[PDB]
Ligand binder design. Sequence first.
Ligand SMILES: *[C@@H]1O[C@H](CO)[C@@H](O[C@@H]2O[C@H](CO)[C@@H](O[C@@H]3O[C@H](CO)[C@@H](O)[C@H](O)[C@@H]3O)[C@H](O)[C@H]2NC(C)=O)[C@H](O)[C@H]1NC(C)=O
Ligand SMILES: *[C@@H]1O[C@H](CO)[C@@H](O[C@@H]2O[C@H](CO)[C@@H](O)[C@H](O)[C@H]2NC(C)=O)[C@H](O)[C@H]1NC(C)=O
Ligand SMILES: *[C@@H]1O[C@H](CO)[C@@H](O[C@@H]2O[C@H](CO)[C@@H](O)[C@H](O)[C@H]2NC(C)=O)[C@H](O)[C@H]1NC(C)=O
Ligand SMILES: *[C@@H]1O[C@H](CO)[C@@H](O[C@@H]2O[C@H](CO)[C@@H](O)[C@H](O)[C@H]2NC(C)=O)[C@H](O)[C@H]1NC(C)=O
Ligand SMILES: *[C@@H]1O[C@H](CO)[C@@H](O)[C@H](O)[C@H]1NC(C)=O
Ligand SMILES: *[C@@H]1O[C@H](CO)[C@@H](O)[C@H](O)[C@H]1NC(C)=O
Ligand SMILES: *[C@@H]1O[C@H](CO)[C@@H](O)[C@H](O)[C@H]1NC(C)=O
Ligand SMILES: *[C@@H]1O[C@H](CO)[C@@H](O)[C@H](O)[C@H]1NC(C)=O
Ligand SMILES: *[C@@H]1O[C@H](CO)[C@@H](O)[C@H](O)[C@H]1NC(C)=O
Ligand SMILES: *[C@@H]1O[C@H](CO)[C@@H](O)[C@H](O)[C@H]1NC(C)=O
Ligand SMILES: *[C@@H]1O[C@H](CO)[C@@H](O)[C@H](O)[C@H]1NC(C)=O
Ligand SMILES: *[C@@H]1O[C@H](CO)[C@@H](O)[C@H](O)[C@H]1NC(C)=O
Ligand SMILES: *[C@@H]1O[C@H](CO)[C@@H](O)[C@H](O)[C@H]1NC(C)=O
Ligand SMILES: *[C@@H]1O[C@H](CO)[C@@H](O)[C@H](O)[C@H]1NC(C)=O
Ligand SMILES: *[C@@H]1O[C@H](CO)[C@@H](O)[C@H](O)[C@H]1NC(C)=O
Ligand SMILES: *[C@@H]1O[C@H](CO)[C@@H](O)[C@H](O)[C@H]1NC(C)=O
Ligand SMILES: *[C@@H]1O[C@H](CO)[C@@H](O)[C@H](O)[C@H]1NC(C)=O
Ligand SMILES: *[C@@H]1O[C@H](CO)[C@@H](O)[C@H](O)[C@H]1NC(C)=O
Ligand SMILES: *[C@@H]1O[C@H](CO)[C@@H](O)[C@H](O)[C@H]1NC(C)=O
Ligand SMILES: *[C@@H]1O[C@H](CO)[C@@H](O)[C@H](O)[C@H]1NC(C)=O
Ligand SMILES: *[C@@H]1O[C@H](CO)[C@@H](O)[C@H](O)[C@H]1NC(C)=O
Ligand SMILES: *[C@@H]1O[C@H](CO)[C@@H](O)[C@H](O)[C@H]1NC(C)=O
Ligand SMILES: *[C@@H]1O[C@H](CO)[C@@H](O)[C@H](O)[C@H]1NC(C)=O
Ligand SMILES: *[C@@H]1O[C@H](CO)[C@@H](O)[C@H](O)[C@H]1NC(C)=O
Lengths: 118, 120, 426, 52
Amino acid sequence: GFLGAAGSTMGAASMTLTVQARNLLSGIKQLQARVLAVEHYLRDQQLLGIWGCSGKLICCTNVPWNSSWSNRNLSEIWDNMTWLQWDKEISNYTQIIYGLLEESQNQQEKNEQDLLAL
Amino acid sequence: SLGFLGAAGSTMGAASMTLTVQARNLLGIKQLQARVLAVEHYLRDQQLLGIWGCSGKLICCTNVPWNSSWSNRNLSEIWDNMTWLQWDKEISNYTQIIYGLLEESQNQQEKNEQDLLALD
Amino acid sequence: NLWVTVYYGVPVWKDAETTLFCASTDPNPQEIHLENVTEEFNMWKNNMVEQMHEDIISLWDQSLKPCVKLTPLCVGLQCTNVTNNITDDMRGELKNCSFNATTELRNKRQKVYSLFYRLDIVPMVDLWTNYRLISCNTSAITQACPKVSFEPIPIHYCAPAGFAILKCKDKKFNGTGPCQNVSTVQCTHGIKPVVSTQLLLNGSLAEEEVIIRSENITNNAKNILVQLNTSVQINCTRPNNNTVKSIRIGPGQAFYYTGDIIGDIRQAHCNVSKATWNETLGKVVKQLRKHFGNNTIIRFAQSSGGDLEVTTHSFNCGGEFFYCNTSGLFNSTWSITLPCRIKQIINMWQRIGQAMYAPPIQGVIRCVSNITGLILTRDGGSTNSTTETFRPGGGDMRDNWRSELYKYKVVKIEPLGVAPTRCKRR
Amino acid sequence: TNNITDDMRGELKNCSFNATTELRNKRQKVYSLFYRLDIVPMVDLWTNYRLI
Ligand SMILES: *[C@@H]1O[C@H](CO)[C@@H](O[C@@H]2O[C@H](CO)[C@@H](O[C@@H]3O[C@H](CO)[C@@H](O)[C@H](O)[C@@H]3O)[C@H](O)[C@H]2NC(C)=O)[C@H](O)[C@H]1NC(C)=O
Ligand SMILES: *[C@@H]1O[C@H](CO)[C@@H](O[C@@H]2O[C@H](CO)[C@@H](O)[C@H](O)[C@H]2NC(C)=O)[C@H](O)[C@H]1NC(C)=O
Ligand SMILES: *[C@@H]1O[C@H](CO)[C@@H](O[C@@H]2O[C@H](CO)[C@@H](O)[C@H](O)[C@H]2NC(C)=O)[C@H](O)[C@H]1NC(C)=O
Ligand SMILES: *[C@@H]1O[C@H](CO)[C@@H](O[C@@H]2O[C@H](CO)[C@@H](O)[C@H](O)[C@H]2NC(C)=O)[C@H](O)[C@H]1NC(C)=O
Ligand SMILES: *[C@@H]1O[C@H](CO)[C@@H](O)[C@H](O)[C@H]1NC(C)=O
Ligand SMILES: *[C@@H]1O[C@H](CO)[C@@H](O)[C@H](O)[C@H]1NC(C)=O
Ligand SMILES: *[C@@H]1O[C@H](CO)[C@@H](O)[C@H](O)[C@H]1NC(C)=O
Ligand SMILES: *[C@@H]1O[C@H](CO)[C@@H](O)[C@H](O)[C@H]1NC(C)=O
Ligand SMILES: *[C@@H]1O[C@H](CO)[C@@H](O)[C@H](O)[C@H]1NC(C)=O
Ligand SMILES: *[C@@H]1O[C@H](CO)[C@@H](O)[C@H](O)[C@H]1NC(C)=O
Ligand SMILES: *[C@@H]1O[C@H](CO)[C@@H](O)[C@H](O)[C@H]1NC(C)=O
Ligand SMILES: *[C@@H]1O[C@H](CO)[C@@H](O)[C@H](O)[C@H]1NC(C)=O
Ligand SMILES: *[C@@H]1O[C@H](CO)[C@@H](O)[C@H](O)[C@H]1NC(C)=O
Ligand SMILES: *[C@@H]1O[C@H](CO)[C@@H](O)[C@H](O)[C@H]1NC(C)=O
Ligand SMILES: *[C@@H]1O[C@H](CO)[C@@H](O)[C@H](O)[C@H]1NC(C)=O
Ligand SMILES: *[C@@H]1O[C@H](CO)[C@@H](O)[C@H](O)[C@H]1NC(C)=O
Ligand SMILES: *[C@@H]1O[C@H](CO)[C@@H](O)[C@H](O)[C@H]1NC(C)=O
Ligand SMILES: *[C@@H]1O[C@H](CO)[C@@H](O)[C@H](O)[C@H]1NC(C)=O
Ligand SMILES: *[C@@H]1O[C@H](CO)[C@@H](O)[C@H](O)[C@H]1NC(C)=O
Ligand SMILES: *[C@@H]1O[C@H](CO)[C@@H](O)[C@H](O)[C@H]1NC(C)=O
Ligand SMILES: *[C@@H]1O[C@H](CO)[C@@H](O)[C@H](O)[C@H]1NC(C)=O
Ligand SMILES: *[C@@H]1O[C@H](CO)[C@@H](O)[C@H](O)[C@H]1NC(C)=O
Ligand SMILES: *[C@@H]1O[C@H](CO)[C@@H](O)[C@H](O)[C@H]1NC(C)=O
Ligand SMILES: *[C@@H]1O[C@H](CO)[C@@H](O)[C@H](O)[C@H]1NC(C)=O
């Protein structure tokens, strides 16, 4: 169910991404609410697009993980944490991570542009 | 680091490095009309890229060859010696032909890929 | 050899007209200077002026809806002379008018007595009455709410996402043509919607010199907007200790009127210095000579007659609409005190059907105010460019707001583009 | 009062009333021609009809 995996561990909650999806899109106040929901959805989709993750729910990237963001191992991160606690732990670095993700895509397309130019 | 449209007066080969800066800045009745028209312009541009098979990309290479009748210039003068505004003015009223060719090329590519993926 | 490559996020734009946001919603400003650009501006084709005009009209009309109507006060008046001490110049200007006003009770009237300015009443002959309110034979009169102020508050116009505003920073920019020092903003600076008819008050000053702007400098049917580089201060006062009284005219309708004047009555005057005004007019004439013959005599004259709202120079000092007489200001050929008349029933802009009543404010009203520009009109080349005569003519209010929006242009962003590359998809 | 044909008898009436003016405390006597279908009889003094 919607947000049912919020209290589950991240390893289990990552398999319900399509359940959390679809609930993002569906007298002046109702129209403002609809426009706001559409605007937030499109901002998130554009943010994925500029990272090279468009059309995917689980997108792997080329940005290495910095141990200063979190020094936990994968077993502790994925089996002993929920997404809410993880989101709280690394919120102070989230925008930095986003910037790095954007930069990686800026390089990646240029490399592809060169590889297809041979 | 230059900011929104900061590269507008730079050359095409330099301004092409700041596409994400422009992309991130594209998103009571009058206020709703302004927000809905901004959303519609964004969605029409995204649908048009999708029709061309360029969804999810900012720099999208295609299979449409360049016609010398659209702009009889070499890459050095186009990319290193002129801006995107001058280019946009130069190829005005040629963009609809290019868009039609891109649409047809993507339709042919989708049929070819479907037929290639239909081989056992 | 070369292939079409599609780019999204291209830093290009087209001229466009769109809906702008009014912020005041306090924005966080940003400004990005555009290096190596040239953009063609035209301040007389700028849709931002029409949109600002429509927004000010709509805000004005909305502000007067939840306010007291003066429909029950459209009655005959019995007017006599004011018994206080007046000068010769103010004889007949102010009248003491008595009338029967309604009360909260439907079947109980009340005798009242109120001072009115002569401009706010019109003769009407009856057995027991002499005058009526000027607007009652044309339109309903709505009282402005005393809790709502008139004073300009600077506002910002902001483009929606997908659009941007270009700002021209060039010195000596005449309002049209190319501009090289161009920057991109999301919101304009704070622009005061100052209401005036002949002089531009509390506006922007030119950075370098006096700038003369005209849609067609050889067409005498167009107004000439002069922006000064130095301000000229105006000290305006109504030296009358007005005592304001009020009566209840309906269940929720309270009406405010002039009760009395404490002490002697003296006229309402604005003082402009003479040294700085003479220097200002010398600068304006020197700049005018660059658009006419160098040996042509340039003379200033009084405005033409007809439509007092245009022939005089309006403000909104305090809360009371002055109407000063610039005839003693422009009477020169190339201090000073200006008799100002006061009205309370104001038909603003050029509209007919919406009359607003400005209630008086108790005490004296004095305000000091920066003159930042002028509106001049030419009489016409009747002498074949031998001598030219300029007058402080009026115009639509758009010309004042255009005098602030001349630096801004709205452009639509076109993120898509195509270009040849050697990059082939496969 | 006019050269009225048989078909128009009783269909148009010449009516007078006290109307207000632009001034609250003034009144004017106004007459006009109304169609019978716009008027309903009323029994009162110094009047015999009202508008529907
Ligand atoms: C041009 O700008 C000047 C400077 O802001 C304006 O004058 C100022 O106007 C304000 C607002 O009306 C005055 O404040 C008022 O002061 C009285 C004092 O009794 C008070 O009762 C009011 O409630 C309000 O606080 C202020 O005194 C005044 N200052 C100066 C130095 O003049 C001027 O009105 C503007 N002109 C136009 C045409 O908009
Ligand atoms: C305006 O007229 C009113 C009368 O309609 C004046 O009020 C009278 O003023 C005299 C002054 O000697 C008093 O003795 C009376 O008792 C007042 N009568 C009322 C009903 O108030 C008023 O003073 C006049 N104002 C001016 C400025 O001339
Ligand atoms: C205000 O109301 C008073 C009520 O007394 C009016 O005075 C009377 O008016 C009638 C006609 O309306 C006259 O016949 C009376 O002789 C008046 N009485 C007196 C004592 O003068 C007064 O005229 C009204 N004022 C206005 C301006 O309408
Ligand atoms: C409707 O009635 C009014 C008054 O009853 C008429 O007006 C009068 O008409 C006569 C001519 O018959 C004139 O001599 C009077 O001077 C008029 N009086 C006024 C006050 O106007 C009117 O003519 C009638 N109209 C019709 C069509 O019968
Ligand atoms: C909650 O924790 C318990 C601990 O044993 C676990 O069994 C259960 O599955 C958890 N809830 C969800 C929804 O995963
Ligand atoms: C990790 O982060 C620190 C500061 O948070 C930074 O100095 C370091 O360079 C980062 N790691 C890498 C590999 O760049
Ligand atoms: C992860 O780190 C924790 C530290 O509390 C440790 O107890 C755990 O054994 C580690 N897991 C692995 C797989 O090394
Ligand atoms: C994030 O920063 C705030 C203050 O900048 C601090 O109070 C908070 O603890 C930080 N979060 C983490 C997870 O360290
Ligand atoms: C403007 O042109 C000069 C000419 O060489 C160039 O050096 C400069 O980088 C250009 N401006 C930008 C923003 O690229
Ligand atoms: C495009 O190229 C073809 C040949 O490749 C040419 O015949 C055609 O005229 C060109 N397009 C235009 C608009 O001239
Ligand atoms: C491109 O064409 C222009 C046109 O004269 C020429 O000056 C320039 O040298 C050319 N560059 C290349 C790389 O062919
Ligand atoms: C097509 O674009 C070119 C680019 O300059 C322009 O010269 C030409 O006039 C345009 N065609 C028409 C029919 O306007
Ligand atoms: C008021 O007095 C002036 C002269 O002081 C006179 O001209 C005017 O007619 C007077 N008005 C009335 C209504 O008595
Ligand atoms: C109202 O009265 C004034 C008094 O001069 C007059 O000029 C104006 O035309 C009148 N209004 C109408 C609609 O007749
Ligand atoms: C402004 O100055 C430019 C300078 O060339 C000129 O071309 C243009 O006509 C001028 N416009 C006005 C309105 O004076
Ligand atoms: C543009 O105007 C600003 C205003 O301060 C100035 O600082 C800047 O140097 C100007 N730009 C150029 C290129 O002269
Ligand atoms: C305004 O312009 C005049 C033109 O002569 C000049 O002398 C004066 O210094 C200027 N003032 C400022 C503050 O720029
Ligand atoms: C508009 O400006 C042009 C510029 O010379 C002038 O010839 C023309 O007469 C002007 N228009 C009018 C109506 O005078
Ligand atoms: C009057 O005007 C002068 C010059 O305009 C100004 O400097 C002065 O402060 C003003 N004084 C008063 C009392 O308004
Ligand atoms: C305007 O000038 C007159 C002339 O004496 C003076 O009495 C008055 O105080 C001045 N007004 C201001 C606001 O200084
Ligand atoms: C201003 O004063 C002059 C003095 O001669 C006068 O002729 C003119 O009519 C006055 N202005 C107005 C609008 O009455
Ligand atoms: C007007 O006179 C009254 C007398 O009670 C006084 O209290 C008030 O302060 C005066 N107002 C002015 C502006 O002089
Ligand atoms: C008027 O001009 C003076 C001149 O320095 C300036 O300091 C003052 O702030 C200006 N006032 C307004 C209200 O613009
Ligand atoms: C007026 O018209 C009615 C319509 O039926 C008629 O009955 C009546 O007799 C008429 N009266 C006169 C006086 O003509």
